[PDB]
């Protein structure tokens, strides 16, 4: 019949062959056009195991987005290894578009339709499709932006939630808008305070289903490169680094409500020219920002968290923002898919 397999996938997109924006440009040669009327077939009485943490689709997407970035966002200087590389570094238009991943002949994608499927285990409602949904390849840490939302309940996905070395992917039901704007390197981002606190209350409540009736604490990153200790992302081709202390700095007892004790949280940000690459070990330097107002607005649709360990602590659990491996970003979207080969 069929069985789990790894194969070379292809991508599909609605890219504009005329557009100068770099995702469009890449997708014009890397991908085919989307199918106007894609077919999805329910597999009656079929049960299948998935593992979002060992899904090779993720790796294929990762290598593609690496290629997109490499040929799109050229640094003035690269220090990959000990050798320094000088080159042209123009400002570009850079705004993600959805990319779909599809199986070639002889292979198929199975799709789990179970509500709040955690990404690992038996799916009861399976369908087959030729392509995934359209995934914007948004590169960020701490907050997942412009991603998919859970239908009904906040959903937690972790390879082992009690293993403090494992990332915890959180998917929200309601998005929280984050509005950013740009010493020409000084910038800042706003989130609605009431909305963000209601979210944390609900995230806390969900975490208690795994960790028990305990106090849930959100705290800032314990360390690492700036890309992961801040919410880093890009807007208008520029690399933003935003301090999220104002977002992760609260203690939620079992009886706590957002109502306890402007309605705006302002996050201080900086636009950096010197950055650590996510694709690759090494440093890249870009040109300063062009004069004028730089603005972008995104929806927070998920979080990347870690949890503190400890051999002794009852009473509370502490969670901190994390990320850095963009494969986890792709996983947050690809968790419900797996590739199979046909007889």
């Amino acid at each position, epitope marked *: 019949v069929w069985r789990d397999a790894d194969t070379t996938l292809f991508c599909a997109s609605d890219a504009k062959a005329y557009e100068t924006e770099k995702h469009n440009v890449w997708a014009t040669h890397a991908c085919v056009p989307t199918d106007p009327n894609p077919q999805e077939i329910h597999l009656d009485n079929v049960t299948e195991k998935f593992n979002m943490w060992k899904n090779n689709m993720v790796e294929q997407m990762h290598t593609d987005i690496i290629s997109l970035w490499d040929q799109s966002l050229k640094p003035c200087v690269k220090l990959t290894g000990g050798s320094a590389i000088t080159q042209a570094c123009p400002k570009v238009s850079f705004e993600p578009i959805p990319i779909h991943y599809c199986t070639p002949a002889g292979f198929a994608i199975l799709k789990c339709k179970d509500e709040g499927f955690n990404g690992t285990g038996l799916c009861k409602n399976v369908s087959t499709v030729q392509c995934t949904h359209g995934i914007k390849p948004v590169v960020s840490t701490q907050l997942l932006l412009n991603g998919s939302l859970a239908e009904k309940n906040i959903t937690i996905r972790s390879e082992n939630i009690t293993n*403090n*070395a494992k990332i915890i992917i959180v998917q929200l039901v309601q998005p929280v808008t984050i509005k950013c704007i740009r010493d020409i390197r000084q910038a800042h981002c706003n989130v609605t305070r009431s909305r963000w606190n209601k979210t944390l209350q609900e995230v806390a409540e969900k975490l208690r289903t795994y960790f028990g009736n305990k106090t849930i604490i959100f705290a800032n990153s314990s*360390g690492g490169d700036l890309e992961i200790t801040t919410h880093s992302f890009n807007c208008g081709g520029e690399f933003f680094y935003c301090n999220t202390s104002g977002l992760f700095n609260s203690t939620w007892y079992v009886n706590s409500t957002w109502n306890d004790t402007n309605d705006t949280i302002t996050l201080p940000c900086r636009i950096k020219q010197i950055i650590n690459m996510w694709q690759r070990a090494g440093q890249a330097m870009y040109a300063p920002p062009i004069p004028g107002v730089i603005k972008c607005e995104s929806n927070i649709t998920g979080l990347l968290l870690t949890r*503190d*360990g400890g051999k002794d602590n009852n009473v509370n659990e502490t969670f901190r923002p994390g990320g*850095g491996d963009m494969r986890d970003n792709w996983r947050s979207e690809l968790y419900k898919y797996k590739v199979v080969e046909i007889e």
Partner: antibody
Amino acid sequence: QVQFVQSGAEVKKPGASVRVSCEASGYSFTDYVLQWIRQAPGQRPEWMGWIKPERGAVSYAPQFQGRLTLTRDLYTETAYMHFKNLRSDDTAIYYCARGVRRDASWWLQFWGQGTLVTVSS
Amino acid sequence: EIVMTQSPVTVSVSRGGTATLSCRASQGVGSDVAWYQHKPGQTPRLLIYGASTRASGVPERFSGSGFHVDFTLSISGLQPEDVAIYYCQQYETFGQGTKVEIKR
């Protein structure tokens, strides 16, 4: 072969600070969690924290939060443990170690030779 | 909060016999347990991981069986060189250790 070479023994007064280094070789340094473990006399092993060298993400045992920092140097593939405000019961052998597999970060197959840190007046 | 409780405190078995060491978890932890040998003044040595998998280089007389909350390390054909303290581990948490000696 996977191998970790640590710095030499340290002797300190209470309140002082120590830095222990751990030189990694024989594997892809950025693809594995690196664990720090100590063992004091007559005591079981005690987890200090870990570091993921690719971007330097860390986790610190709660009892050491505020005086423990873990860093790395990717050019020399060396990890460092910085441990401050030392107390006499910090006297122990300190190790860096690595798991059997990338997805088995706790099952410590490979250990540095250990570093004795003695803290006393 | 996870507690790993080892027993007995001391195992005393004649040479060539089998030592059976137990480790109980305070809550279910699947197969996620490891065992170490420790001799004073030496680096701890991984014996068994994932409850039952023998680590590279470890003699075949060491074996493990465990799941959920109960975990066992067995040493058949006990040798004087196996005299040591043995620790179980669940991620960052370690048991208190069990000493194994030769009975003579």
